[PDB]
Each structure stands twice: as structure tokens, then as C-alpha cells.
Structure 1
Amino acid sequence: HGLYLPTRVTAIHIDPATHRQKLYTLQDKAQVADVVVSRWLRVTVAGGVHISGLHTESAPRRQQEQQV
């Protein structure tokens, strides 16, 4: 629980050509990309992007408590 922000990424690969190839239009005019997250392998792949070794660290709540 709580909010985690990125602090380190081991490696990221981007390829616009494969990205254009991957995008498939939906029944409406929108363009969509299919994503997969393999936690065993530590890879987040979607279209032409490939995030490996993402590490996130918890961040203290601002405790602004603007609501009283």
C-alpha cells in the first residue's frame, strides 16, 4: 500500500519502428497498445518500449491534511 515512486531503472529500450508496427487501432478511432508485466522476469513490455529492473521506493505521505 501507500504510494511508491520510481528511483532506479536498470535498463530501458525504445524502438519507434517496432512501436509503429505494434500499435493496433481499436474499433473506435483510438489507437491502443497491449502491455504485459512479468514480475518473475522484472520486465514491463508495451509496444516498442522495454523496461527492465524497475525499483520503486515508498515515499512519506505529505500529511498536508488539508481536510480537517
Structure 2
Amino acid sequence: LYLPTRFTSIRIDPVTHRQKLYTLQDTTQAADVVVDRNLNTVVAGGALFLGAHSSVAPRRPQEHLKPILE
């Protein structure tokens, strides 16, 4: 389980974004995402991440879900 913790450089440009977007046959709207783990950069439409370091979190056992063992 991994939450975000640091970004090094996010860069959003809503103009290029409107543009980078398209329309599926669904009639819905989507754009292409790409992850380059060797460069640590996620891009999608008009939002470009860089060094978006996420990190571990402790699963907290909710004991209103302890199983009945028979």
C-alpha cells in the first residue's frame, strides 16, 4: 500500500490539455497516460509529473471483520 509523499515537479498546462484530450466512441472523454520509470515521469494530457515519489503505509486491521473459525 503506497501513498504519495513527494513530487519533484508537477506541471499542468490546461490549454495543451484541452487539446491532448480525445473522445472514445463511448462518447466519453480520455487521453493517453505514459509512465517512464527510468525517468520517473508520468504524463497524461496536460499534466506532467516528475519524481513523484510515493511510499508505504501500514494496513490497519479493522477487527469488526475478524472471521468466525469453526
TM-score, normalised by the number of residues in structure 2? 0.88
Find the structure with the greater CA-based Rg: 2
The runs of 5 or more residues in structure 2 that have no matched partner are: none
**Cα separation, 1, equivalents of 2:10 and 2:3:** 17
Range that drifts further, 5-14 or 55-64: 55-64
How many residues align structurally? 66
Where does the alignment leave 5 or more consecutive residues of structure 1 unmatched?
A: none
Identical amino acids, percent of aligned pairs: 64
Query: 2:30 aligned to 29, 32, 51, which one?
Result: 32
| TM-score, L = length of structure 1 | 0.91
Match of 2:10 in 1: 12
